[PDB]
Amino acid sequence: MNIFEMLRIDEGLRLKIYKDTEGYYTIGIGHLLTKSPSLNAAKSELDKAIGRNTNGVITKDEAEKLFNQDVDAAVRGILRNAKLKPVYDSLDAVRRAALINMVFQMGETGAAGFTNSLRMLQQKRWDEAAVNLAKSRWYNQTPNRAKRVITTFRTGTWDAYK
Ligand SMILES: [Cl-]
Ligand SMILES: [Cl-]
């Protein structure tokens, strides 16, 4: 298991524009297009992202290309974030993937907002962090996915994804 496979399980793969859990226009493997309610605005952002007139549909290869870019960006966002970098550096390989997953889903700002959890993770207080992570809108809104990430942080294994 790895970050790519993990996120592919969590986000799915859709080749036509769709609405995410928050009702936002998305495509491929969890690639957010826009928060705007307009499909046209979505189609426009899509074409600009792909470099062609897509008519709201992309191929598997195009989806994967967006995905590679998105993962790279998440990582890079973590490394540039003063609150995130230190935690990431302190963690083992498996838990690093859990942190990338959160950043991919909620953005650097959102993840960085988990001040208390981050500190606990940095202290390697697994059970406490898991409890704290659960007291969030994130957990209440997408509980199954949140549980998978939380277990990953808690155990340092991929058990929740097998
Ligand atoms: Cl893009
Ligand atoms: Cl969920």
Per residue in 26-42, is it b (16+ CB within 10 Å) or e — as a string?
bbbbbbbbbeeeeeeeb
Alpha-carbon gap, residue 40 to 36, rounded angstroms: 9
- Of the ligands numbered here, which is closest to the C-alpha atom of 51? 1
State which approach was used to obtain the coordinates: X-ray
Instruction: Report strand pairing: 25-28 vs 14-19.
Output: antiparallel
Distance between Cα 50 and ligand 1 center (Å): 8
Token readout for 28 is: 């491929």
Three-state secondary structure call for residue 69: helix
Q: What is the largest CA-CA distance in the chain?
A: 50
* Positive/negative CA dihedral, 157, 125, 79, 148: positive
Residues with CB under 5 A from ligand 1 (ion): 49
Contact 158, 98 (CB under 8 A): no
In angstroms, this model's resolution equals 1.9
Token readout for 141 is: 């809104």
Amino acid letter for position 72:
D
Catalytic residues: 11, 20
Would you kindly state where each structural domain of the chain is located, as residue ranges? 1-162
Contact 162, 107 (CB under 8 A): no
Distance between Cα 141 and ligand 1 center (Å): 26
User: Does the structural domain 1-162 have CATH classification 1.10.530.40?
Assistant: yes
Distance between Cα 8 and ligand 1 center (Å): 18
Q: Which of 52, 94, 100 is nearest to 76 (CA)?
A: 100
Contact 87, 121 (CB under 8 A): yes
Binding-site residues from annotation for substrate:
32, 104, 117, 132
Contact 121, 105 (CB under 8 A): no
Distance between Cα 142 and ligand 2 center (Å): 4
Token readout for 128 is: 């406490």
